[PDB]
Swiss-Prot record, chains A, B, C, D:
The chain holds residues 62 to 129 of 1084 of the full protein. It comes from the Eukaryota. The nuclear export sequence mediates the shuttling between the nucleus and the cytoplasm. The PxLPxI/L motif mediates interaction with ankyrin repeats of ANKRA2. This is Histone deacetylase 4. Phosphorylation at other residues by CaMK2D is required for the interaction with 14-3-3. It comes from Homo sapiens. Responsible for the deacetylation of lysine residues on the N-terminal part of the core histones (H2A, H2B, H3 and H4). Histone deacetylation gives a tag for epigenetic repression and plays an important role in transcriptional regulation, cell cycle progression and developmental events. Histone deacetylases act via the formation of large multiprotein complexes. Involved in muscle maturation via its interaction with the myocyte enhancer factors such as MEF2A, MEF2C and MEF2D. Involved in the MTA1-mediated epigenetic regulation of ESR1 expression in breast cancer. Homodimer. Homodimerization via its N-terminal domain. Interacts with MEF2A. Interacts with MEF2C and MEF2D. Interacts with AHRR. Interacts with NR2C1. Interacts with HDAC7. Interacts with a 14-3-3 chaperone proteins in a phosphorylation dependent manner. Interacts with 14-3-3 protein YWHAB. Interacts with BTBD14B. Interacts with KDM5B. Interacts with MYOCD. Interacts with MORC2. Interacts (via PxLPxI/L motif) with ANKRA2 (via ankyrin repeats). Interacts with CUL7 (as part of the 3M complex); negatively regulated by ANKRA2. Interacts with EP300 in the presence of TFAP2C. It is found in: Nucleus; Cytoplasm. Ubiquitous. Belongs to the histone deacetylase family. HD type 2 subfamily. The lineage of its organism: Eukaryota, Metazoa, Chordata, Craniata, Vertebrata. It is linked to HDAC4 point mutations and chromosomal microdeletions encompassing this gene have been found in patients with brachydactyly and intellectual disability syndrome. However, HDAC4 haploinsufficiency is not fully penetrant and multiple genes may contribute to manifestation of the full phenotypic spectrum.
């Protein structure tokens, strides 16, 4: 056999290509989910950090007012 | 002034935060678009690469069979 | 001509396919950027909405404490 | 209790918000993974469709050339 073989080799190669690409897409999406959740938590911490300071601010505006 | 100052300092600090985060999102999306477009073209150059060989395959199959 | 014509037709149909696919990716990224910025701002409007209440909370805690 | 209570209510309401947003991020990424895998397969099906036709094209080019 020969052309029948190369005919069989390409078919399999092609079917192996699809399998490979679908996983790389999963990796690309996984890569991004990570970067995305990462920036999402940071943003969040800055916004919370705001809460833990918008606190002391409005706190000292009265927490000592009783002495001012 | 003073408490009114820290009050005004946080308000601006906040609005500055929003402006900042919204651009980091743009950088995150811009980052991914590039990664995404990158794999998309590779995947494609493999599938095309296939074309340029699934070619020489059926090619020498008959084009040579003619001499056989 | 004829087979040579079908050769040329497929080549053109190929280059045309590439162009179409690249824009669909763009429409896909565009679709996502929108959904992403959209949810991003909501999350934010809940975090701020929190600020505008974590405010009144500690407010009437002291703002009227002068009467308590 | 009361102010101490409204303090506890906000701390919980906050922790609850985080948990909610983190899942909406997941629903957002899941929505996109699907749109992405979906368009990735179509793209592919058009590239294969080109294979299963660039076939016949080069087929009849010779497969009948034996009679042309």
């Amino acid at each position: 056999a020969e052309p029948a073989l190369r005919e069989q080799q390409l078919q399999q190669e092609l079917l192996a290509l699809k399998q490979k690409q679908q996983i790389q897409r999963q990796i690309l999406i996984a890569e991004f989910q990570r970067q995305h959740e990462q920036l999402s938590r940071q943003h969040e911490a800055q916004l919370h950090e705001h809460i833990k300071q918008q606190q002391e601010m409005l706190a000292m505006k009265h927490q000592q007012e009783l002495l001012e």
